[PDB]
Specification:
Subcellular location (chain C): Nucleus speckle; Nucleus
Largest sheet of chain D: 5 strands, antiparallel
CATH architecture of chain D: Roll
Radius of gyration of chain D: 12 Å
CATH superfamily of chain A: RRM (RNA recognition motif) domain
CATH topology of chain D: SH3 type barrels
Shape of chain A: globular
Strand order of the largest sheet of chain D: 4-3-2-1-5
Protein name (chain C): Splicing factor 3A subunit 3
Helix content of chain D: 10-25%
Radius of gyration of chain A: 12 Å
CATH topology of chain A: Alpha-Beta Plaits
Strand content of chain A: 15-25%
Number of strands of chain A: 6
Largest sheet of chain A: 4 strands, antiparallel
Number of domains of chain A: 1
Number of helices of chain A: 3
Chains: A alpha+beta (about 90), B mainly beta (about 70), C mainly alpha (about 280), D mainly beta (about 80), E mainly beta (about 70), F alpha+beta (about 80), G mainly beta (about 80), H mainly beta (about 80), I alpha/beta (about 160), J mainly beta (about 70)
GO molecular function, one term (chain C): zinc ion binding
Order of helices and strands of chain A: EHEEHEEEH
Structural class of chain D: mainly beta
CATH class of chain D: Mainly Beta
Number of strands of chain D: 5
Strand content of chain D: over 45%
Order of helices and strands of chain D: HEEEEE
GO biological process, one term (chain C): mRNA 3'-splice site recognition
Oligomer: part of a larger assembly
Distance between the termini of chain A: 22 Å
CATH class of chain A: Alpha Beta
Family (chain C): Belongs to the SF3A3 family.
CATH architecture of chain A: 2-Layer Sandwich
Distance between the termini of chain D: 28 Å
Shape of chain D: globular
Helix content of chain A: 25-40%
Chain lengths: ~90, ~70, ~280, ~80, ~70, ~80, ~80, ~80, ~160, ~70
RNA sequence: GGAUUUUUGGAGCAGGGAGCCACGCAUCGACCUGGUAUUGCAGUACCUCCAGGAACGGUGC
């Protein structure tokens, strides 16, 4: 899994309401660069997860290394580079 | 006898504010000069009502849930 | 060298943004607008510009012979707007005088003159109250013991701003008597003009206003010529040509001959009519 | 693209039972089988019903011509 | 039926007992004398049912078109 | 057009003008206007004479209006009757 | 026939007009146009549940009119001729 | 109509729109039709209770608009 | 690189990921917060990350401003009249700044709508009782440093400091 | 005949009453068939609010009176 | 030149009572305590379940 503009986060406390989760995610991750968008759903499949998309790639890498296992709403988050490119990135590139 | 400029919104998911404080969501399948709409996979805000006709008369506002 | 009297300090100073054309930098004050509003206030049309000015002249008269009842809403509002206008005009036309000094002078005259006897005294009716009560009083004694009564408290507490504005209109109009007269004159003149006269006069006011403060293709042709018409050459990159004269010029060209000769079809004039 | 009028023409042909949302009245909706309709969206409904969303009560109407003025929305029902 | 439109339906119902609901919830039962292009309506021997209950017996009546919610034969 | 005024539902108004008969007009304002039709039009604008306006406020109320013009949109219902008689 | 034409003849009459929103207007007609837009002078206008206000001029969008109360004197039979 | 021409002039500018129901939409006017139908983008909406929201894309029917506020950049059609 | 009217007018303006109108003032090396009048109170969020601001002060009356992202600056003091210029301030992100004393965080008690507060990576964080101090002095905060303010902490902060 | 009844008041400050009962006061600069109005330097009263350059739809207009004379500018 | 975006109208109507404080009925929504399930790579009406709390908010009469 090569470096990516989007990071995949899992192991998140799924009791936080969706709009609050996204707003704290935005706040926390703004320290490394502009976050273009955040995709997070509460379906059974997707609960406890989120995709955070950054304009700059260096920002994504810095975020990944610095916030690995950061306690968020009580649990240590696990971060990884996303498997695919985010739709928004693909549209912004071409 | 103008058309509403809605081709941009064709086959997109939309959020429709209707009179009476009523709100529904669905995919735009077509329209006419009166702004009467065909909305597919429509949902009353939630219960699924399928493909429906909305009379343009009672359309307050629409909002795209997609990027156009 | 010598074009604009204004100093670099105030290089973007413009009077026309302070004075309208009808005011002529303090020569006149434009009261037509207020004549309009006034018509709207009296709910009729029996009032002419000149009769309106005749009304303004009132400003004891403005107090004891009021155009309208001084407790009328429309009237008090109008009077407010007008007062404000006259004051701003005053200080606008006399920049050099200390505005604050004048303001304070008037304010102190307002406070100090009234308190003892309403400053307005009659040998018959006694002492009049300005704006709030609109009543006279036998002696100064009953006048003083009336300035604490619930009535006068109410009125002085509700109609204060209006009374004060009325007063300002009064004193500022007094200070501008010469301008008031000057304008009334202007009105009568313009009024007694003809068409051509009034027009030329307006021309003059205009010139004074906007004067330096210190003086020193076609389709019908491309269709006729045969151009901008869709056409294509096949041998050249399936290229498009917009005219038949132009395509007839393609027959002698660098690239067209390069396609021929490099294709193995030698140049010049036998192959001219080529397409495919 | 599906045109709204055509959808109706479809409803007509299908004899699907139809539920109509009325204008500025939420507590009552109307139901029936579209037999025909006109340029003003005026509808001829068969075996029609007033549906009280509040009272869960139905009023039986039979042959109805509903003016289109009232139409907010047109939906189909399995019943 | 093979397409039965508004206009013919109403024309078939002329000469007949009808009831008209108005948008405002009043109801008017009577013999439909006539209708016009704008769907204004003329009843004879009209009766008024408000809250579904007989209120007033009114006679000959014009109803302005914009008031009409629906018409029923009855 | 006259034919449609003559035989259509508006014949109620056409008949009232011709016979100078009374009609009660139920009105949008929740008021009722009782009187004679001097003139009318497509929209049901009317010029009315000897109008008794009646309403309620419970308290009933009424008032006499000799001459008046009614904009026809306010019309709910127009009633002809053995009223004039 | 077209009764707005009749109203257009009533310049310089004084009338009372009742509005759709309940407001009551008493003034002198300066002009009625084809849309029944009505213009007046010397107007005493009483919005429902206020004391009157007087306006030198008032202009009403035609559709907002409920009805005009006309002068008792008005010679209707004259005005109805075209 | 003269006002309509001035509306089309505001296309590409930030405008405010109040509906018949009093919701207040502020953002960029993309397209304005002859009948006052309005396409806008990157909206801030202020409801009757006072609360705000954010929308990317909207389209409001002309009839159901009470009014619009346009820039003052336009004010400078003085012929009429 | 003064924060100027001209600067604000050419600044990226957009609808952010949480659906709010945000102004981008990142990486300009701004030292002092000033001239915000020119934004015309049109933003829900203002991003001042990666700048050199020393004090969170100098704001005009901004009624719509609800989110302030102030990451990687040099904030060492908070102005005293903040609620008077920012009445609905609901979220304040101060990560990686220079607040050193618990008492320097006192001015945040006056922000009545403040609900989301982040002061991580500030020296003040390592002060004894830093969390309880914030909870008692700024009770309107519901989420502090991305952790829920809980009842037990409120009570514990009521004992100490009572 | 004249069509002037609106054109007269053009450029003037005008008090316009809306169907909900609001009061819009601005400089009357333009109108049309529907009575859609163009109001410069417009404020709303009910609570005064500065609006600025306003286009009001005629559907929602009830009435207008003269509020003050034209500003000279 | 009265049939969906303007001018022939979807309008009309309903709130005081009790001692500054508090409030009938119906529908929907987050929502707040506990506890509990789920470790899943996406582009979203909404989103685990179990028990308790609503001097919560919006709409209609």
């Amino acid at each position: 899994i090569r470096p990516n503009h989007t990071i995949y986060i899992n192991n998140m406390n799924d009791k936080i309401k969706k709009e609050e989760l996204k707003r704290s995610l935005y706040a926390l991750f703004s320290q490394f660069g502009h976050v273009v968008d955040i995709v997070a759903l509460k379906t059974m499949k997707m609960r406890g997860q989120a995709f955070v998309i950054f304009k700059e790639l260096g920002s994504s890498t810095n975020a990944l290394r610095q916030l690995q296992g950061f306690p968020f709403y009580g649990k240590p988050m696990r971060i990884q580079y996303a498997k695919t490119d985010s739709d928004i990135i693909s549209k912004m590139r071409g | 006898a103008h058309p509403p400029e809605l081709k941009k919104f064709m086959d997109k998911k939309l959020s429709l504010k209707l009179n009476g404080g009523r709100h529904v969501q669905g995919i735009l399948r077509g329209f006419d000069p009166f702004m009467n709409l065909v909305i597919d996979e429509c949902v009353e805000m939630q219960n699924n009502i399928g493909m429906v006709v909305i009379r343009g008369n009672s359309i307050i506002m629409l909002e795209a849930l997609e990027r156009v | 060298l010598k074009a604009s009297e204004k100093l670099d300090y105030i290089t973007y100073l413009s009077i026309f943004d302070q004075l309208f054309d009808i005011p002529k930098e303090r020569k006149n004050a434009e009261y037509k607008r207020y004549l309009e509003m006034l018509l709207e206030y009296l709910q009729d049309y029996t009032d002419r510009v000149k009769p309106l000015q005749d009304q303004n002249e009132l400003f004891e008269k403005k107090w004891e012979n009021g155009t309208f009842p001084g407790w009328p809403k429309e009237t008090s509002s109008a009077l407010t707007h007008a007062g404000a206008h006259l004051d701003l005009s005053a200080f606008s036309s006399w920049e050099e005088l200390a505005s604050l000094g004048l303001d304070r002078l008037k304010s102190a005259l307002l406070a100090l003159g009234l308190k003892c006897g309403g400053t307005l005294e009659e040998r018959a009716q006694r002492l009049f109250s300005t704006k709030g009560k609109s009543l006279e009083s036998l002696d100064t004694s009953l006048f003083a013991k009336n300035p604490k009564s619930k009535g006068t408290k109410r009125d002085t507490e509700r109609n204060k701003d209006i009374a004060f504005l009325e007063a300002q209109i009064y004193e500022y109009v007094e200070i501008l008597g010469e301008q008031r007269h000057l304008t009334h004159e202007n009105v009568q003149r313009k009024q007694a003009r003809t068409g051509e006269e009034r027009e030329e006069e307006e021309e003059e006011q205009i010139s004074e206003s906007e004067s330096e403060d210190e003086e020193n293709i076609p389709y019908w042709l491309y269709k006729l010529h045969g151009l901008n018409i869709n056409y294509n050459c096949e041998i050249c990159g399936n290229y498009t040509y917009r005219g038949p004269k132009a395509f007839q010029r393609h027959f002698a060209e660098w690239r067209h001959a390069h396609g021929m000769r490099c294709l193995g079809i030698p140049n010049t004039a036998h192959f001219a009519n080529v397409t495919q | 693209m599906v045109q709204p009028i055509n959808l109706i023409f479809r409803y007509l042909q299908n004899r699907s039972r139809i539920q109509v949302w009325l204008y500025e009245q939420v507590n009552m909706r109307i139901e029936g089988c579209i037999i025909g309709f006109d340029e003003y969206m005026n509808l001829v409904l068969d075996d029609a019903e007033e549906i009280h969303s509040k009272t869960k009560s139905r009023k039986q109407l039979g042959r109805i011509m509903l003016k289109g003025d009232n139409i907010t929305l047109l939906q189909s029902v399995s019943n | 039926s093979l397409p039965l439109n508004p206009k013919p339906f109403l024309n078939g119902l002329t000469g007949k007992p009808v009831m008209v609901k108005l948008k405002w919830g009043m109801e008017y039962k009577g013999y439909l004398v006539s209708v016009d292009g704008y769907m204004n309506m003329q009843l004879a021997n009209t009766e008024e049912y408000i809250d579904g209950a007989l209120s007033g017996h009114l006679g000959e009546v014009l109803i302005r078109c914009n008031n009409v919610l629906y018409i029923r034969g009855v | 057009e006259e034919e449609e005024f003559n035989t259509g539902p508006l014949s109620v108004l056409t008949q009232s003008v011709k016979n100078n008969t009374q009609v009660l007009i139920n009105c949008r304002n929740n008021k009722k206007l009782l009187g004679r039709v001097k003139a009318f039009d497509r929209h049901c604008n009317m010029v009315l004479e000897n109008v008794k306006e009646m309403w309620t406020e419970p308290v009933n109320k009424d008032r006499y209006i000799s001459k008046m013009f009614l904009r026809g949109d306010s019309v709910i219902v127009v009633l002809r009757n053995p009223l004039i008689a | 026939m077209k009764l707005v034409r009749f109203l257009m003849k009533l310049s310089h009459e004084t009338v009372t007009i009742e509005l759709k929103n309940g407001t009551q207007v008493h003034g002198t007609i300066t002009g009625v146009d084809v849309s029944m837009n009505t213009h007046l002078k010397a107007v005493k206008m009483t919005l429902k549940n206020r004391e009157p206000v007087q306006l030198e001029t008032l202009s009403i969008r035609g559709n907002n009119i409920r009805y005009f109360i006309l002068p008792d004197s008005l010679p209707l039979d004259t005005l109805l001729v075209d | 109509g003269v006002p309509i021409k001035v509306l089309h002039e505001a296309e590409g500018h930030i405008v405010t729109c109040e509906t018949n129901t009093g919701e207040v939409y502020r953002g960029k006017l993309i397209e304005a039709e002859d009948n006052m139908n309005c396409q806008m983008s990157n909206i801030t909406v202020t409801y009757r209770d006072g609360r705000v929201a954010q929308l990317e894309q909207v389209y409001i029917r002309g009839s159901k608009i009470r009014f619009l506020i346009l820039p003052d950049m336009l004010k400078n059609m003085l012929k009429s | 690189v003064k924060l100027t009217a001209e600067l604000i007018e050419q600044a990226a303006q957009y609808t952010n990921a949480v659906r709010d109108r945000e102004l981008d003032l990142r990486g300009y090396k701004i030292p002092v917060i000033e001239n915000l009048g020119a934004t015309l109170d049109q933003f829900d969020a203002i991003d001042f990350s990666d700048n050199e601001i020393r004090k969170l002060d100098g704001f005009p009356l901004l009624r719509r401003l609800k989110t302030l992202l102030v990451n990687n600056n040099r904030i060492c003091r908070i102005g005293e009249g903040l609620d008077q210029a920012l009445p609905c301030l609901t979220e304040l992100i101060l990560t990686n700044n220079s607040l050193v004393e618990l008492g320097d965080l006192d001015p945040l008690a006056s922000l009545k709508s403040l609900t989301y507060l982040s002061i991580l990576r500030n020296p003040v964080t390592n002060k004894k009782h830093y969390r309880l101090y914030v909870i008692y002095k700024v009770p309107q905060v519901r989420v502090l440093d991305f952790q829920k303010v809980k009842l037990k902490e409120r009570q514990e902060a009521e004992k100490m400091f009572k | 005949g004249k069509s002037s009844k609106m054109l007269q008041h053009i450029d003037y400050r005008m008090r316009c009453i809306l169907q909900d009962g609001r009061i819009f006061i601005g400089t009357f600069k333009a109108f049309d068939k529907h009575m859609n109005l163009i109001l410069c330097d417009c404020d709303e009263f009910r609570e005064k609010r500065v609006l600025g350059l306003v286009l009001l739809r005629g559907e929602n207009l009830v009435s207008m009176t003269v509020e003050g004379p034209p500003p000279k500018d």
